[PDB]
Write a protein that binds this DNA or RNA. Sequence first.
DNA 1: GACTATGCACGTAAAACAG
DNA 2: CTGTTTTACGTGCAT
DNA 3: AGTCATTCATGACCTTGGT
DNA 4: ACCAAGGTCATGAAT
Lengths: 196, 199, 435, 432
Amino acid sequence: TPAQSNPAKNELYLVEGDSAGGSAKQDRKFILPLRGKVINTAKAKMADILKNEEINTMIYTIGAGVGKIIIMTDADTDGAHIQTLLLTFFYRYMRPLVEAGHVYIALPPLYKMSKGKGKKEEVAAWTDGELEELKGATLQRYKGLGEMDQLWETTMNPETRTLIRVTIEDLARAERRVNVLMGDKVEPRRKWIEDN
Amino acid sequence: TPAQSNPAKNELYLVEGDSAGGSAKQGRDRKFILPLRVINTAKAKMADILKNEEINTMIYTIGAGVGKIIIMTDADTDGAHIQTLLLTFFYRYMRPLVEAGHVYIALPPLYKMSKGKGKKEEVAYAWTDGELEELKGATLQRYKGLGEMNADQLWETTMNPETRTLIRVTIEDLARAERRVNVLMGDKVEPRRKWIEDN
Amino acid sequence: QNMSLEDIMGERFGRYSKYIIQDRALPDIRDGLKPVQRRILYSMNKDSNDKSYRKSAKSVGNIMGNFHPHGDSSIYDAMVRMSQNWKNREILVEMHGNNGSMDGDPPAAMRYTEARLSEIAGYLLQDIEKKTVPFAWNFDDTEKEPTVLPAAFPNLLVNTDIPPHNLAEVIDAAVYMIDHPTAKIDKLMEFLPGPDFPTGAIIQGRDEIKKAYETGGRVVVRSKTEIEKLKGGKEQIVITEINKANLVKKIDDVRVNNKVIELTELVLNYLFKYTDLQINYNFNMVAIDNFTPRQVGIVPILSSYIAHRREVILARSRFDKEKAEKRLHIVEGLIRVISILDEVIALIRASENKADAKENLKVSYDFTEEQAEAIVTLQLYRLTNTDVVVLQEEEAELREKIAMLAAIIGDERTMYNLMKKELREVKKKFATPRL
Amino acid sequence: QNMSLEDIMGERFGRYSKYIIQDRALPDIRDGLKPVQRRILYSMNKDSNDKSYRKSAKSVGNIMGNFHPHGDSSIYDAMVRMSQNWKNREILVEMHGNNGSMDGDPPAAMRYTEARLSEIAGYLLQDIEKKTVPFAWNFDDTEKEPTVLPAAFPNLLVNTDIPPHNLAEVIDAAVYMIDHPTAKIDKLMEFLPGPDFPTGAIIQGRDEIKKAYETGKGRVVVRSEIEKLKGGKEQIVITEINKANLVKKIDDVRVNNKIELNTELVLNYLFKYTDLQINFNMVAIDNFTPRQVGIVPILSSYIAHRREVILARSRFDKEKAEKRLHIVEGLIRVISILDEVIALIRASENKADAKENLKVSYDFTEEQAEAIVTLQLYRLTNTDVVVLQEEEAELREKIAMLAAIIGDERTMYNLMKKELREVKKKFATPRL
DNA sequence: GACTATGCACGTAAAACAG
DNA sequence: CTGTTTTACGTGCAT
DNA sequence: AGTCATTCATGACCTTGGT
DNA sequence: ACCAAGGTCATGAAT
Ligand SMILES: COc1c(N2C[C@@H]3CCCN[C@@H]3C2)c(F)cc2c(=O)c(C(=O)O)cn(C3CC3)c12
Ligand SMILES: COc1c(N2C[C@@H]3CCCN[C@@H]3C2)c(F)cc2c(=O)c(C(=O)O)cn(C3CC3)c12
């Protein structure tokens, strides 16, 4: 389940599903496909979490335990719930990991632009206000870490994308993470979508 | 893996893949069933065959061993290799089974004909060759293999046993074990290339 | 530059936000189709499925690459769901080849099933044709996709939880609500005494439902149980939106633990509350109205769906009307043209180009482009303009409909008389018994 | 009645027969596409795929329910196969999204991959358009399906086993064979010294191949860097096999102590045992009948296969012209009396009434009469007064040539040359 | 969304065959 | 601890 | 061509909880 | 072994 590799710069990219972790394992590790939706930490029991191969396999690779790990999702709003949890999975447990702040959440491409139908003319992480900088040609829109060699546009230049996480967290934020994700009493969640 | 059931008439229908054995287990208009999802007997070793869950699960259900089991394929020429083998699998081992001749090989439908687009007007034929002529203005079908037949329809080969089936093996004898070691199983290649002189 | 460090107070607020508006993939108060549905009913349209049974692979594939980025079997799987008669009242898609037993039956992959849009199925997608419900963009940005199919059959309360209620009772109330707007929940339950399930049988909770219809509660539901006497002198009481997958063994569990089935009538009473052979039900009236997720009730739902059609009909009006106008105008023109077919057939020869010819119809006329067009797009066939007297007749034929349609536009009262005759119409054709 | 008892001497003869003609699902001596292939290249056509990358689900789905009853993943799976550059020479379909490593890589289901018909891909399906190759019926009996796509690029020997041989060498021989029919296998190997593999490198067996090219059976050979590292150590490492087991196979030698870590004899041990330097079975279907052939047959039938493709594209395109010059030839005439004609077509009667009545003031035929009536008042501006005249010669030239390709055995091949040369160049490949 | 057995042929590298 | 036969492993298209 | 775990919510039926 | 809290299992549309 891992993807091979001297902890000179850490280096541990966390992909979504064997298509991604397959596309990735095929250009820049100084990899471990996380399969399906991970467990909601604050959503069950500690014994619970120890039974889950997703929590297990994770903490196996790289020691740590309770007492550059890049995390690669997609664009899917489906792909967020898989950012959302993992961070909680990196947070409630493995605090210092992101307390140090060594963990970072990779910045995939949005809309690639094309042109010549034989001369090849490609481009490249916000198809909103960003995309305007780029008729007569062609476009695309990126459907999630998979349909992407190209992969070294988020792969083989680490800083060319990534985003460093957790900076100056603190407290009163553990308030929101037991509010938003995990598993509140429902009441709170229905409630955070007053800003929705 | 079986499909439930007093050996009053034997009764054991052998389908192809859990789609069929699923369509059948629902259409049990006639279980007085087990999905087969097979090894070429004369193609390996006895130890071999004992290792294969397909030989195993088979001989499990119903005792017998070495010393009305209807078998339901499709129309697929793919679906034959699964007639071809099983019979060898019913033959080289479990001889008397078909030596008695208690086993039969089910006669699925070929081309179903349709008509009214709301009044429902269906048919049936087990040979869309010379048979089909007995049946413009209407519509037709062609049957793609034991599956696309709903569970209800399925009682057209299901809930009238004799309405279809075909009894097997009758007056075999010897000099036929000659051809079955020639045709299927696993000859030396030479023989097989050779039987397609009548092909 | 590995830039942009951010707060987990930040990023877990922003991601989780995206994902929560992905919980308006839930049934709308109008269509009552939850998008992964809406889209499979449209793609089976657009592709023309009264015809023969089209495989699946193609069907799902085509759903799955034009209107739905997500999984294959996620897509189709959901489709099978709409195939299961014992899941809906009107099955909004008919397939063939092992739909799947109430007896815990895994249905077979796309590789085997053939399907096709179903009768009542027609209904909902029964007027996408025109500029009816407002259609949006593809994700690929290729085709366009509709945002809630306009809907004949009130899929919403005839199918967040909302239990079946039977076209029969639904369009019946539907009727009432219209001609009488302000209505009490007690007088409207007269039409829908309760939810009909495919496996209805018996549902208990008159006062429990009654309140629930505005509150948006808990009912009750009993099995199809039989009392009869076998031979030799023994008891024969056996069984004919639950699940037969666990009640089959659940019966035989009672016997296995000898703690209480054609083998005392108080005895049936034990299983009839513990063996899950008379469970149920709950109700959780919850959809999306005003593009915003809300709990509603028997009055809202019918309320918005009345309003949802108010604007379907209004559209089918405003449109079909404009299509006529546009026709009566080249008819109105071609008639005229008859008068001087000779002169016209004249300068269109000695004219010059194509675009040269229409312009030059500034003289000997005052026709417009769309006027001029067909006068030049004609073909020497129709120069046999037999419509000499007919076209005259059209001027009144097509002007009648443009009199009616535009009348539906100001006529609030006539409007509903439409939505009646129609709803009554399904009431009858695709009408259901009771349960 | 449970009727019809039968001999297992009977039934096992008759079933097994059906199944064995299901072993002419094997590459044809012409297309060199094995049906499950042929059909995916056509369905990706018919649907128009130079355009954008169309998902898969739709692509396979559509292959899978119009031309192929069998599995989904059986279908698509095989498609992926045609995506793998390191599997063919000309990859007859380009996809994007994890084709699959030489490093033992499971490709992802239809749910992810997007694909599209490939450059050289074009080639083969490059003239289905007309009544070229003879097309048969659907299984559903819905559309019709072609029985061997006509083929520009000699997929057959450029791709029962037949190893790559490189468009370069192939059309080069192809050339020779034509203008010189009877040829020896030795003079023709001059053009194709051997099969090129995507991972060619080194292939040994000059006398072994030479004989094999007529015998259609034999065995060749195939071989897999020398440099000096720092500090004074040996650095000899590696750059149609499989890298899935050679990765560990190297490290197996080390594990059993029996690779930039200094005897050159050492490399010799691995280079024959470690599978780091590990046949041919010329076999297809010709004359709708499964046969072994060789370098001469294959080119022999494919020459003949085009002989009849070209002849078709002749006989057809010719007939399409005839049919055009005839309503041109007609409409010209009609100009002369546009006035009179524009006449009775008014006072005529019906539609079908109007064309008939063009028995008088003319002798035109139906197809003649048609467009004279199907016309539109636009074209009554019949500017072609003088042009159409010109067409009579434009379209009559081509009907002079095409029909000339019909008797001209010698001119014919000069076609099949210029074309085959044409791919030789455009979709031309280096060497290996 | 990757596990898994098998047939169909035919090569051959890796186990079992004896004393 | 040999040299032999024998055995399983691999590959595309199906089930 | 089935296998398998989990999210997300919400309920009734079973597993612990203590002595 | 009571009666109560906690624990599980299940259901559609996704990964
Ligand atoms: C067994 O569920 C699935 C899994 N897995 C969950 C399992 C347990 C944990 C360890 N991993 C396995 C793999 C997966 F990885 C992908 C899909 C999937 O793509 C899909 C579809 O829409 O096509 C449908 N399903 C199921 C709903 C049928 C998928
Ligand atoms: C794993 O192979 C398959 C099996 N099985 C073989 C396994 C080992 C023995 C015990 N049974 C399982 C089931 C099956 F039953 C059906 C299909 C199938 O339909 C299909 C396709 O064309 O869609 C493709 N494949 C594979 C080529 C991908 C199938």
